[PDB]
Design a protein around this ligand. Structure first.
Ligand code: HEM
Ligand SMILES: CC1(C)[C@@H]2CC[C@@]1(C)C(=O)C2
Length: 405
């Protein structure tokens, strides 16, 4: 289903890429998206899929667009347009200077100091989850660790019941990797139906949880409104439940296939941080965009007001002009360049939390289960969207080779 080409779009700039169902998905999602960086593809193209929109395919252009909020606004960040229009999360759907005030508040609940205080809890949970799996000799990583570990940590930070995870997770996934079950607007309504009552209670009887902190926060000297708190908490929910969860699976899938990389981290622990950055570059998984506020000529191409442009954060680090042999994983890269956590005024605030969860997982897993692989006959399948992921990851290992700690 390709939409008719708009009058201002030159035919030689057309490349019908479907971000929700790319062609080479079987080869891996990152590989599927990297086709946009082949020599036969211009730096800026137009796809007729998903209603029609532009796509910047180079790190230089992606960074430029993200820095220039004057021309590329966050008002409508999701594709298709219907999704971008229904999108109203704070502070991502706002442009500076308005954005700044809310960003400062959000930083209060997921910023560095919060991570520092939750460190011991993150470590305890990781160790507890791994030790319980260790003797089994097998697991479905996605549902046995990748989901429980980060989500439980977030539910703890937000003060929400673990029983609500299945419900919340489903709604979250519909927003980033649309199933077709429901429209973005409906998924958002449902999520808000859940939050409204909670925020109400937290306003009257505040707690120390992130939601209580957001609901009673102050912005621009005055107090935050119920609506503003609802829209910010909606964002925190999606970020906590559908980001680290998917990234861990990509990384573990790779480590399961590369004994040499596992050994490297086991023998030279001082390399884990560097390795984390490289994995964040190679397995980048986010791709959202902006909307043109007015007619604008960008790198020789004429963009029209209202035109939507996808600026794949995942492509910057895969761009060969930024990283030599981009598909190769090299923990000793002199320079790891990427925009996995974003670029510009909307740089990810939860990246400190994410890095902590990734590093702890790598260290604690390889300590107890240094040897593992993908189950024979299992076919790992990736899924594409605003946030890409792994359908399932069956792992196997010999318990006799594990180490209780
Ligand atoms: C590996 C995991 C993660 C990745 C790759 C990631 C990626 C991103 C990206 C690319 C953006 C910018 C979006 C844009 O410019 O339109 C962003 C923003 C944001 N992320 Fe993360 N994120 C991750 C984890 C988290 C976590 C754990 C949270 C916490 C709930 C979170 C909260 C946020 C917030 C608050 C923003 C909005 C900042 C603003 O608009 O000023 N993220 N993230
Ligand atoms: C693109 C993102 C990864 C970022 C945090 C959650 C997310 C889905 C948004 O809507 C903003």
């Amino acid at each position: 289903n390709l939409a008719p080409l708009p009058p201002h779009v030159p035919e030689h700039l057309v490349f019908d890429f479907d971000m929700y169902n790319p062609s080479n998905l079987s080869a891996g999602v990152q590989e599927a998206w990297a086709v946009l960086q082949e020599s036969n593809v211009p730096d800026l193209v137009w796809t007729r899929c998903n209603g029609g929109h532009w796509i910047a395919t180079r790190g230089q252009l992606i960074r430029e667009a993200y820095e220039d909020y004057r021309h590329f606004s966050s008002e409508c960040p999701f594709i298709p347009r219907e999704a971008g229009e229904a999108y109203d999360f704070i502070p991502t759907s706002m442009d500076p200077p308005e954005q700044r005030q809310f960003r400062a508040l959000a930083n209060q609940v997921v910023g560095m100091p919060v991570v520092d205080k939750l460190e011991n809890r993150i470590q305890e949970l990781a160790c507890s989850l791994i030790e319980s799996l260790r003797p089994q000799g097998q697991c479905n990583f996605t549902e046995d660790y990748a989901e429980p570990f980060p989500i439980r940590i977030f539910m703890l930070l937000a003060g929400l019941p673990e029983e609500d995870i299945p419900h919340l997770k489903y709604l979250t996934d519909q927003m980033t990797r649309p199933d077709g079950s429901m429209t973005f607007a409906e998924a958002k309504e449902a999520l808000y139906d859940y939050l409204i009552p909670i925020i109400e209670q937290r306003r009257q009887k505040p707690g120390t949880d992130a939601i209580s902190i957001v609901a009673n926060g102050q912005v621009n000297g005055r107090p935050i409104t119920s609506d503003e708190a609802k829209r910010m908490c909606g964002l925190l929910l999606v970020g906590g439940l559908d980001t680290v969860v998917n990234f861990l699976s990509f990384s573990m899938e790779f480590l399961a296939k590369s004994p040499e990389h596992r050994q490297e981290l086991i023998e030279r622990p001082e390399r884990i941080p560097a390795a984390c950055e490289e994995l964040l570059r190679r397995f980048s998984l986010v791709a959202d965009g902006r909307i043109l506020t007015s007619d604008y000529e960008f790198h020789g191409v004429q963009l029209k007001k209202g035109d939507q442009i996808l600026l794949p954060q995942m492509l910057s680090g895969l761009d060969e002009r930024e990283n030599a042999c981009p598909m190769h994983v090299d923990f000793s890269r002199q320079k790891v360049s990427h925009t996995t956590f974003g670029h510009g005024s909307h740089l990810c605030l939860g990246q400190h939390l994410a890095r902590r969860e990734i590093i702890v997982t790598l260290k604690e897993w390889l300590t107890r289960i240094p040897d593992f692989s993908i189950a024979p006959g299992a076919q790992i399948q990736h899924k594409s969207g605003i946030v890409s992921g792994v359908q399932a990851l069956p792992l196997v290992w010999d318990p006799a080779t594990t180490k209780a700690v």
